[PDB]
């Protein structure tokens, strides 16, 4: 017997649509924002970001914890065997979306995990450099879209990198206000919307088999 393609929290239909629509609305508002139009060089050396991020998750959205590749990924077997993983497998959770972000590569939503959910976050030998100085689980994210020649994986890195840019920042940096939060320009095509009111989505922790 083998492992899943990856473990994660898969949003209900109701919450997928709610978060997915939140994403589009952000893409549509950002692409029309003046600050964004001024930095368009990083997307086209106006633009509809909805089209730019044409590769979206087709069905339900999800928050990946541990990519296992059926055991072919390092740390995979070590993660699945954990008690908390077995005990949580199938259980429902509420994920907190604190921000939406975009880069030239990906678009997605930052997830802020509860202590219980942090127990479900892997602890591998191999770490992305961008996870430096950042608390565990920071990479927690929901992918909303990717550029044509970009892999979804990149979304987690794009989040981490963004968190580096704001590491030691304040809300006085905000470019301006969007209807649901403050907009930040972290340079180099990186934009983040920090939600005034955090979004909450029901999801189930389980294993996906591609
Ligand atoms: N190397 C990886 N690390 C973490 N998640 C990964 C990795 N590779 C793929 N994924 C994720 O698994 C899905 C199917 O491949 C992809 O859509 C990625 O999911 P997301 O967490 O949505 S970026
Ligand atoms: N209006 C601009 N167009 C192109 N590059 C710009 C512009 N303004 C600042 N730069 C910067 O000049 C360098 C060469 O492009 C790069 O450092 C550009 O900055 P960024 O990579 O966009 S942070």
Domain that holds residue 71: 1-210
Q: How far out from the chain centre does Cα 199 lie?
A: 13
Q: How far out from the chain centre does Cα 5 lie?
A: 18
Among all bound ligands, the one having the nearest atom to the CA of 124 is 1
Compute the distance between CA of residue 21 and CA of residue 204 in angstroms, rounded to an integer.
20
Q: Phi-psi bin for 37: left (phi > 0), alpha (psi -120 to 50), beta? A: alpha
| DSSP line for 147-193 | -TT--TTHHHHHHHHHHHHHTT--GGG--EEETTEEEEE-STT-EEE
Cα–Cα–Cα angle for 113, 117, 119, rounded to 5 degrees = 120
The rounded Å distance from CA 122 to ligand 1 centre is 14
Neighbour tally for 145: CB within 10 Å: 25
Radius of gyration of the chain (CA): 17
79 lines ligand 1 (CB under 6 A): no
Cβ atoms of 205 and 91 closer than 8 Å: yes
Domain at 91, CATH number: 3.90.1740.10
For the record, the structure tokens of 89 come out as 């497998």
The rounded Å distance from CA 199 to ligand 1 centre is 22
Cβ atoms of 8 and 64 closer than 8 Å: yes
Q: Per DSSP, what are the bridge partners of residue 106?
A: 146
Number of domains in the chain: 1
Backbone angles phi, psi at 207, to 5 degrees: -120, 135
Active site residues: 62, 141
Cβ atoms of 106 and 146 closer than 8 Å: yes
Could you identify the atom of ligand 1 that is nearest to the CA of residue 57? 17
| DSSP line for 94-114 | EEEEEEEEE-SSEEEEEEE--
Compute the distance between CA of residue 69 and CA of residue 123 in angstroms, rounded to an integer.
16
């Amino acid at each position: 017997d083998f492992l899943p393609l990856y473990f994660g929290w898969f949003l209900t239909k109701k919450s997928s649509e709610t978060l997915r629509k939140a994403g589009q609305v952000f893409l549509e508002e950002l692409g029309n924002h003046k600050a964004f139009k001024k930095e368009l060089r990083h997307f086209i050396s106006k633009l509809e970001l909805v089209s730019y991020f044409g590769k979206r998750p087709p069905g339900v959205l999800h928050c990946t914890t541990k990519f296992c590749d059926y055991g072919k990924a390092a740390g995979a077997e070590e993660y699945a065997q954990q008690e908390v993983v077995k005990r949580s497998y199938g259980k429902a959770f509420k994920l907190s979306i604190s921000a939406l972000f975009v880069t030239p590569k990906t678009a997605g939503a930052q997830v802020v995990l509860t202590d219980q959910e942090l127990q479900l976050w892997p602890s591998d030998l191999d770490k992305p450099s961008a996870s430096e100085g950042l608390p565990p689980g920071s990479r927690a994210h929901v992918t909303l879209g990717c550029a044509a020649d970009v892999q979804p994986v990149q979304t987690g890195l794009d989040l981490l990198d963004i968190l580096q840019q704001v590491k030691g920042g304040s809300q006085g940096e905000a470019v301006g206000e969007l209807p649901r939060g403050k907009l930040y320009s972290l340079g180099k095509g990186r934009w983040m919307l920090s939600l005034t009111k955090k979004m909450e989505v029901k999801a189930i922790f389980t294993g996906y088999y591609g």
